[PDB]
Symmetry: C2
Subunit: 249 residues, 2 copies
Amino acid sequence: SKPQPIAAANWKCNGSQQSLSELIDLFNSTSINHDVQCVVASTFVHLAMTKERLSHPKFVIAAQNAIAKSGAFTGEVSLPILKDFGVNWIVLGHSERRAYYGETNEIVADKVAAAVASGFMVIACIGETLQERESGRTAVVVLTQIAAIAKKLKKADWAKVVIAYEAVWAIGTGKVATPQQAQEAHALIRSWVSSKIGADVAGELRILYGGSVNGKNARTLYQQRDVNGFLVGGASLKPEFVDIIKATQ
Amino acid sequence: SKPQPIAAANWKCNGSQQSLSELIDLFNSTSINHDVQCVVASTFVHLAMTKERLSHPKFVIAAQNAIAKSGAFTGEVSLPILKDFGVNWIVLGHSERRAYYGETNEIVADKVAAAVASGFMVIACIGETLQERESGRTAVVVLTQIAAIAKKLKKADWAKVVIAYEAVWAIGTGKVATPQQAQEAHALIRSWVSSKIGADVAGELRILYGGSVNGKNARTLYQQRDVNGFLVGGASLKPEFVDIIKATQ
């Protein structure tokens, strides 16, 4: 049977204090009558306000990135700073950081391992580009990405890990994975984990889909066997994020 | 006469809420009897606290980095978000970001121009490494860095710019540039601005020194004709930062 689902709002590099305050008020009023972990990943600047204003007990706050250690890293935020700030969830390896900000499979893996060692719950992101998908390389790309993560973890660490599978080619392009595409990617991931890490870990692992999830398409994705919730970008800045939450019943 | 000096604290990726709040308490209680712009550049997470707590009229808050626009840039903070948050100073092109985080001369220049267009005061950092210095390439490296920044600015924009010359081989290593080394680098930078931009702009520009500035060495550096204050890393996390402020006369 499925583990507790997750509905993760990745606000990306967006928001004003007023627009996010208004959105948080809507989140606080949503009536959620099943077990689902909701996650709001704000920019670093907005963590203070989001922590203060977000009070719905089924929601937690997350960061969108970090580096492993404090020190002479002008502009970056470290895991200990986030831990001191009361943030215990983090998104790492997002496709935009892999593309834009130098995060290779190994750099992602090392960030993930450092965040687990610090005590975080980690949404570790993987996923293939349009060119990878079109040329038949989805499986080798996704498996290589997760193998790098696994290399740096031990079996018991997986209790603190969530995988987000991103159809990278669906982000911002007017495309979306079909339920069969999402299912086949999640099933591949899960089977690899079962065989490399253990059947017990694989059954408990949450694997989330990202790439144009919205209030209308969420239920049809969620009802697939190996989908445990969503990594939501654009729709998480909108009232219909609550419909995405409701789709994980 | 020299232009108004600047004492800039670059906390880098350091601090707890409590340890930084205690530094702010010290700054708030400090008596300063000359004109000096003090700047506190904290991590993004700590901006809310510093905005609420810092009250000294000679101090402003700053960010340590940004990207130009909001959007699908997971993990980053943009200029519009900082502007909405009430942050009007920013450090850009710091040596650590040039080294670790992909910031070429051109990326630094484009960030600086975007910040100036968005209304910010900008501390734009340049400086050569140990290998560049040992190779005799200090002049070509530093002049090429500032030339890239200047290509994206207009004459009027220099009123919003401050240059920080970092002796990169002196960052964190506890061995400061001698007075003569700093003065010669600063005089070279100014001569460029004078020739390329104008004698007026050159004479008003603040050129700050960074690299192991501390309470004990700051006054002697400040006596040099082309030094207009300091970009302070390690000592800005310590009580002696106040002595570095007092040294800017």
